[PDB]
């Protein structure tokens, strides 16, 4: 299970406030590098180090700074963060041969104001009486809306346990306001089961969504509740025919 560790996993910040994403590696790999991936632009290298105290700028290094004082760590510093530095970051390391192993990645969003941060609204929709009569299968529809940024993890839980068979979560969030830079997002997942199963009123269906927002540290002035990292859910119970 030995891997590249990036901390933290998710992050929100105001333009300006500097930050640093660490990357740990316990494979004694002399090669370490950082990549940012953007839609339509793919994976881009920022800086790379072939060994300790060895550093070389990648294709897009502007605004980024690194240090290789030790072999295990290869942190990435952003002195004066910009909204266009909002992206999916990855840390890779190579040793034997030249095969690289990627950290699970870090999602960073640079906003001009933390007032733009919104948690998700989860609501689940009961299957169509029509769907059962015609298919004899039941499909539930989870709906997560109005959250900013695009940092979430959805999952279905049935009777207290996680579900996977019969679920299809959209691969990527949807920009509610495509034309807006600060648009809020939305995502849906489906759960289809036997019409038999759903008609059982003893069956408990819960949709859970992980929200990666602000930390108990950041300031909050607004009246609405502090959009902190939290978990929101929506349920539904079996309905007799």
């Amino acid at each position: 299970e030995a891997q590249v560790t990036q901390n933290p996993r998710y992050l929100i910040t105001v333009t300006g406030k500097k930050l640093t994403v660490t990357c740990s590696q316990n494979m004694n790999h002399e090669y370490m590098s950082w990549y940012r991936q953007d839609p339509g632009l793919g994976l881009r290298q920022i800086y790379y180090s072939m060994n300790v105290e060895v550093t070389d700028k990648g294709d897009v290094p502007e605004g980024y700074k690194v240090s290789r004082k030790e072999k295990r760590n290869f942190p990435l510093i952003l002195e004066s963060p910009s909204p266009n530095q909002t992206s999916l970051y990855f840390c890779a390391s190579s040793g034997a041969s030249h095969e690289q192993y990627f950290g699970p990645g870090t999602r960073l969003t640079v906003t001009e104001d933390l007032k733009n941060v919104f948690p998700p609204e989860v609501a689940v929709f009961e299957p169509s009486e029509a769907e059962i009569s015609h298919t004899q299968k039941a499909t539930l529809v989870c709906l997560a809306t109005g959250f900013y940024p695009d940092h979430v993890e959805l999952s279905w839980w049935v009777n207290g346990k996680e579900v996977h068979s019969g679920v299809c979560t959209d691969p990527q969030p949807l920009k509610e306001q495509p034309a807006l830079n600060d648009s809020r997002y939305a995502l849906s997942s489906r759960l289809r089961v036997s019409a038999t199963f759903w008609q059982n009123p003893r069956n408990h269906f819960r949709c859970q969504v992980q929200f990666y927002g602000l930390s108990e540290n950041d300031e909050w002035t607004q009246d609405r509740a502090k959009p902190v990292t939290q978990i929101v859910s929506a349920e539904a119970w079996g309905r007799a025919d």
Binding site: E30, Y31, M50, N51, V54, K57, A96, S97
Partner: protein, 274 residues
């Protein structure tokens, strides 16, 4: 004729005196082009040949990165070598690496190299097939096993038949007027008597390029090892080389002996007689 590109890296341990010293140097048919000194201030890969200064910044930023890396690599290798040979942390050891590719007249790949040496002794090396390794001993066999699994062989192989050769071809073209010159050695005979019944005849070879050359002594049309002295080919310092051969000759018997000079800059082999 054919040509060659070689990379020599050297790491020496300094227990108590800090981090091991690392030096790396690269050649092109006996012509040095760059070097890298861990204890130098620059901390970069520096130019040693005129025709290599025309390369872009990107070039030097890279070479430095890799070479700097390698240093740490072997820095680590040394720490392990200790463990493998169960040696104390008090002594000083040496770790040399040899990396190079050789090409023919057509500029087509001919042969590749990549070997290691611990305390000046053969450790592990890539065979002619560039598919398998040769472990000098029990310790070397443990690393061979790892690189086997790592698929290192195939990496190198490809690098050699690729990156190396093309780089080589490019250097050759970039250093045309210098690298492809074939200086003929200038010759002369010197005579010094040592006794009433003996005297010495030294055959000199001056200003030749490359270093490869053969100086052979013959007595009445027959080679002779008996009573001959042979110096290691030596660098003149201005790019050319030098070397000579001597023979203990009975007095008045000077003409029986013939000096033979062989070098690719020579159309016909040269023969000297006093």
């Amino acid at each position: 004729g054919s040509h060659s590109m070689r990379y020599f890296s050297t790491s020496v341990s300094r227990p108590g005196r800090g981090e091991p010293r690392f030096i790396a140097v690269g050649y092109v048919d006996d012509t040095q082009f760059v070097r890298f000194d861990s204890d130098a201030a620059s901390q970069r890969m520096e130019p040693r040949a005129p025709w290599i200064e025309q390369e872009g910044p990107e070039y030097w930023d890279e070479e430095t990165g890799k070479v700097k890396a390698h240093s740490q690599t072997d820095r680590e290798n040394l720490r392990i070598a200790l463990r493998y040979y169960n040696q104390s942390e008090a002594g000083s050891h040496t770790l040399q690496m040899m990396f190079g590719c050789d090409v023919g007249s057509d500029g087509r790949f001919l042969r590749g190299y990549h070997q290691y040496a611990y305390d000046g002794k053969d450790y592990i090396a890539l065979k002619e097939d560039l598919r398998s390794w040769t472990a000098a001993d029990m310790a070397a066999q443990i690393t061979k096993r790892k690189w086997e699994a790592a698929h290192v062989a195939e990496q190198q192989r490809a690098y050699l038949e690729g990156t190396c050769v093309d780089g080589l071809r490019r250097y050759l073209e970039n250093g045309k007027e210098t690298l492809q010159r074939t200086d003929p050695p200038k010759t002369h005979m010197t005579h010094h008597p040592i006794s009433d019944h003996e005297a010495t005849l030294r055959c000199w070879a001056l200003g030749f390029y490359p270093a490869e050359i053969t100086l052979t002594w013959q007595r009445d049309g027959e080679d002779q090892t008996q009573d001959t002295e042979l110096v290691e080919t030596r660098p003149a310092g201005d790019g050319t080389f030098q070397k000579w051969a001597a023979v203990v000759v009975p007095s008045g018997e000077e003409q029986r002996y013939t000096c033979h000079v062989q070098h690719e800059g020579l159309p016909k082999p040269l023969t000297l007689r006093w």
